[PDB]
Design a protein around this ligand. Structure first.
Ligand SMILES: COc1ccccc1-c1cc([C@@H](CC(=O)[O-])C(=O)[O-])cc(-c2nc3cc(C(N)=[NH2+])ccc3[nH]2)c1[O-]
Ligand SMILES: [Ca+2]
Length: 223
């Protein structure tokens, strides 16, 4: 997250770190046994780390659980990143509490202008890598479709939306992929891609979760 601030330990109880010997992507806890993340963060040997804050020190409240299965959306296209969503079922349920809680799925899509909270342990620099130890937060609005399409002509599908700042300096970045974009207490987006990080006129692009609600529910139901 570039241009963000320290969230404060466990202030974002639904955030998870996907670890394969190191933190590589974020994710959102949606029920005690399932997490939603991005399809391009898929790999085997994933351990889900809940209740985290400083990812390099155990401080307490952390729960490490291996993933049972990862279900990448069947229509996920790696070249366009269309349908960049994945469900990971945990080997055992997490114990929910105030530091580990699920987030709600939406009932409507959100409008441009809605303000959301984006978090992650991704790069904090737009030029070079600087990965933090604690969770970073950023408040960003959803942009209109015309501003999104002007920024990325021919690269935005109806399963994506843009959020951020056209002037640059504040944005999500690599390492943040798979994590949450929460607006009015609902999971509306998944950190997916962007051109560089926090570059002028190149906002973050997010998976439009409201379009996968029925799929999430059905897929969780049948598994
Ligand atoms: C397939 O790529 C990945 C697989 C697993 C984990 C991260 C990535 C991933 C990789 C890479 C690097 C790879 C490198 O240089 O090492 C690449 O290909 O540009 C970038 C991202 C990434 N960039 C991002 C930029 C933004 C943004 N708001 N501007 C948001 C999410 C991003 N995720 C990103 O999500
Ligand atoms: Ca820790």
């Amino acid at each position: 997250i570039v241009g963000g601030y320290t969230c404060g330990a466990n202030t974002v109880p639904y955030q998870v770190s996907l670890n394969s010997g190191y933190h590589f992507c974020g994710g959102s806890l949606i029920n005690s046994q399932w997490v939603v993340s991005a399809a391009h963060c898929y790999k085997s040997g994933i351990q889900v780390r809940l209740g985290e804050d400083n990812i390099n020190v155990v401080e307490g409240n952390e729960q490490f659980i291996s993933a049972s299965k990862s279900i990448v959306h069947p229509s996920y296209n790696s070249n366009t990143l269309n349908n960049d969503i994945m469900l990971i079922k945990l080997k055992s349920a997490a114990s929910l509490n105030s530091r580990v809680a699920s987030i709600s799925l939406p009932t409507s899509c959100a409008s441009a202008g809605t303000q959301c909270l984006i978090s992650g342990w991704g790069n904090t620099k737009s030029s070079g890598t600087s990965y933090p130890d604690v969770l970073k937060c950023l408040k960003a609005p959803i942009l209109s479709d015309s501003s999104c399409k002007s920024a990325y002509p021919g690269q935005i599908t109806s399963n994506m939306f843009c959020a951020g700042y056209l002037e640059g300096g504040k944005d999500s970045c690599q390492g943040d992929s798979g994590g949450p974009v929460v607006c009015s207490g609902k999971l509306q987006g998944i950190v997916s891609w962007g051109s560089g990080c926090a570059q002028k006129n190149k906002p973050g692009v997010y998976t439009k979760v409201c379009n996968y609600v029925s799929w999430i529910k059905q897929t969780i139901a049948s598994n």
